[PDB]
Design a protein around this ligand. Sequence first.
Ligand SMILES: CC(=O)N[C@H]1[C@H]([C@H](O)[C@H](O)CO)O[C@](O)(C(=O)O)C[C@@H]1O
Length: 308
Amino acid sequence: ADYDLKFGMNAGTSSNEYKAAEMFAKEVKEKSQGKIEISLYPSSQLGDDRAMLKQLKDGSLDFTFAESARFQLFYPEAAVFALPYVISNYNVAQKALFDTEFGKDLIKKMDKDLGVTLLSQAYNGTRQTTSNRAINSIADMKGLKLRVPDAATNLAYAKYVGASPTPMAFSEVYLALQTNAVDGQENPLAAVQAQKFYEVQKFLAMTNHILNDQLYLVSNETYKELPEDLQKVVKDAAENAAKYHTKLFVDGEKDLVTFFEKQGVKITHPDLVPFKESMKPYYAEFVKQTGQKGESALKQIEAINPHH
Ligand SMILES: CC(=O)N[C@H]1[C@H]([C@H](O)[C@H](O)CO)O[C@](O)(C(=O)O)C[C@@H]1O
């Protein structure tokens, strides 16, 4: 094609993210009259999300996914998106990004400093905790060997609830769980399904601890080469795909617990009051580390009403 473009992702071929990227790819090809074709590179083939963001910056990858929280790698205050229990729901995540001074500035920095244009935002689920033993209460976390992604906020979740974290790439998790090298992991229900972690985890606890969004990002190096009519095709397709993406997640959260029960998983509902209480020293550490910019981001986000 005139523009042979590439979209990389950690998510695999059975995932919601991939299904929505397929919708995006198909719409772009159709509405560009074949000028643009987007090929998908799932399952971390190109590296992880940190690697893929560098490739968008350099212009060697055209599209990728990232959470708003992942930008904590560059702007420490952006950890606010994934401080456990701070963002209440997806309504709040949307307004945090687009309707706060903090979020608007973050979007501008991503363009100026990181070489990426934000096309759309979707919901990617609320993270839960799977394990090889029941989590009936916060006590059951103590010493649990909990795999985390290589992200500070997930590491802190694990630390502050009393678990023993092991960071590792998404691609390595299934084997770690299968072999009981670790005792558990944490991800939204849709990922537990997509990765088939239910095959190798007997328990699932509704910890509801971190809310993931998902940004459709394009390399500025690529986006600047597309004539404006094709920029609009791409932008409009990303917005349409994001709405679909969100719906996939919302619908799964309604019935995936029954799916997991049919696969033999035992579901628990630990009291979350101690889980929330356990994060209070972490929020204080965040404020100490990130200073006024972090205090401000927190205040801006805490001000958002969660009801539509
Ligand atoms: C956009 C993206 O790659 N998201 C990935 C996230 C983030 O890397 C992590 O939450 C830090 O932001 O990690 C996973 O949930 C995980 O490894 O368990 C896989 C998911 O596909």
